[PDB]
């Protein structure tokens, strides 16, 4: 599964995390989020700055 966690730009929410509060309920793929999203931190930090995890 995909996991993008980077608080340096914006809150972190994994695909299977289930965070419908951010307009992304269960099932909502990370690709669903618009690349043109507006954030306070990310405003200056690129979105690609994120770092995919890799645990067991």
Full set of structural domains in the chain with CATH? 1-56 (2.20.28.10)
Q: How many Cβ atoms from other residues are within 10 Å of residue 13's Cβ?
A: 19
CA distance 17 to 43: 24
What single DSSP character describes residue 7?
A: T
CA distance 56 to 40: 32
First vs last C-alpha separation in the chain: 11
CA distance 55 to 35: 26
What kind of experiment solved this structure? NMR
């Amino acid at each position: 599964m995909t996991a993008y966690r980077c608080p340096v730009c914006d809150y972190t929410y994994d695909e299977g995390k289930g965070d419908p509060r951010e307009g992304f309920p269960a099932g909502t793929r990370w690709d669903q989020i618009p690349d043109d999203w507006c954030c306070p931190d990310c405003s200056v930090r690129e979105k690609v700055d994120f770092e995919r995890m890799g645990g067991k």
